[PDB]
Each structure stands twice: as C-alpha cells, then as structure tokens.
Amino acid sequence: THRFVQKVEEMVQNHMTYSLQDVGGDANWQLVVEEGEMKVYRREVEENGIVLDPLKATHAVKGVTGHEVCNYFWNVDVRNDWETTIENFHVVETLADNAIIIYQTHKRVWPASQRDVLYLSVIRKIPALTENDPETWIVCNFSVDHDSAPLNNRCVRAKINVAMICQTLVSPEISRDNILCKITYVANVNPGGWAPASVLRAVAKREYPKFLKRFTSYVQEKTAGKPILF
C-alpha cells in the first residue's frame, strides 16, 4: 500500500468498465487501419485547437499469454528492446513490486517541440468475474505529479492515460500452438502546448500500428520455446 493505491484502483476499474467494450458496432469510432486481427481506431477530438484523438486498438497474438504480454509491456528492463520513440527514461520512484513512476522523453518529431511525460505504471491481475469468464491482465500508464520531476527546457509536458488489457484463450501439456492473447490497447494523450494538428495525426497513424506490430512480435520472439507463464 503506497499513496496511489486508490487512484490506481479507480483507473484500472474504469478501464475494465469502459475500455474493454466492443467497438465495431460503434459508429463513434473511426476504424483507421486494419492489418489482419490488428485493428486501430481513433476519434477525432480537439480541445482549444490541440489534437487529443483517443486511440483504441485490438489485436490477437498467437503463442503468448496476457500475463506474458503485460510483464513485457511493464518491465522497464526490456523497454529499450522494443521502444523506438523514446530518447531517455528514468524511474523516479518505486511504489511497490507492481508499480513505479517513470519519467521519459520522446524523440522530437519535426517541427513540433520535444515532449516529456511523467506517469505511474502499474501491472495488475483481475480475477475472472465468474468461472465462466477469462481472467485479465492489465497495465495502466497514467500521468501523475511528482516533486522529483526533471527540469527539461527542451520539452513540453504531455499527459497520458494508456492501458494495455489482455485476455488469454486456450484451446486445449498445453502448447504455445494452442494459446491466443486478445489485446485491447487504449491511449488518451494530451500533447500539451501546441503542435500542428497534421503532425500529431501523422505521428499517431504511423507510430501506433508500428508499435503494436513491433511490440507483439517481440513478445512472441522472447517467449517462444519457454514454459508458458499463464
């Protein structure tokens, strides 16, 4: 029990309530890019001329579990292996074995100024609602304030609320051949400051599918031929 346990519970529960709902019957979501089971949706939203466009994606990854996907998403020691848009990151505070506060800077995308972020990152297991249902693994990354925040005069401070939500199906020794992880990934980013709307939309449209294809392939790569961590 650290000082964020209640805020964590609330963000996690809001994701479980709202973020998992199916979009596809929902015309409010624009399906922007499909590549197989990878589907990436946005809503076009701006506040005081700043693009906020909610991002929502689903995916189905053969051969890995939700537990594994989330550990790898969460574990700072493998970040450099799959991240391509980060210039620097620092762990600012360890809250618990499942929660940390991270400071990170993103590579500049010309001509906007550089962005930095300060966020709590927590990984959690949500037991099945009934023995009929899937257990779920979630990572939530959401912006928080911290006294130890770096001074970075190059950077505008972005605010994020991101969740990677994972459910695992097995069609039955259980083999990697028989496992499928369904991912829901949501990212609500306020970039701060101003940035050209066209720049923000082009960076999102390029970087989110790249990230999901890349990150998920990395998890397949690292886990293959290892005992399955359900």
Ligand X SMILES: CCCCCc1ccc(-c2ccc(S(=O)(=O)CCO)cc2)cc1[C@H]1C[C@H]1c1ccccn1
Annotated binding site: 83, 104, 141, 185
Give binding residues for an N-acylsphing-4-enine as ranges: 83, 104, 141, 185
Neighbours of 229 (CB within 10 A): 10
Report, in Å, the least distance between residue 178 CB and ligand X.
28
Q: Which stretch binds ligand X (CB under 6 A): 6-14, 30-38, 142-150, 191-199?
A: 191-199
Taking each helix axis as running N to C, give the angle between helix 66-74 and helix 197-223, from 0 to 180 degrees, rounded to the nearest 10: 120
- CA gap 17, 34 in Å, rounded: 25
Binding of ligand X at residue 38 (CB under 6 A)?
no
Binding of ligand X at residue 218 (CB under 6 A)?
no
Percent of residues in the chain assigned helix, strand, coil, to nearest 5? 25, 40, 35
Binding of ligand X at residue 186 (CB under 6 A)?
no
Site string for ligand X, 43-72 (x = CB under 6 A): ------------------------------
Binding of ligand X at residue 118 (CB under 6 A)?
no
∠ CA 74-78-79, nearest 5°, is 70
* Under 8 Å between Cβ of 150 and 103: yes
The DSSP secondary-structure symbol of 151 reads: P
Identity of the residue, 42 or 228, whose beta carbon is nearer to ligand X in the bound complex: 42
Which candidate, 89, 97, 96, 114, places its Cα nearest to that of 203?
Answer: 114
Which residue in the set 70, 101, 158, 166 belongs to the binding site for ligand X (CB under 6 A)?
158
Name the residues that contact ligand X, by CB under 6 A. Answer: 85, 106, 109, 112, 115, 117, 141, 158, 160, 162, 187, 189, 191, 195, 199-200, 203-204, 207-208, 211
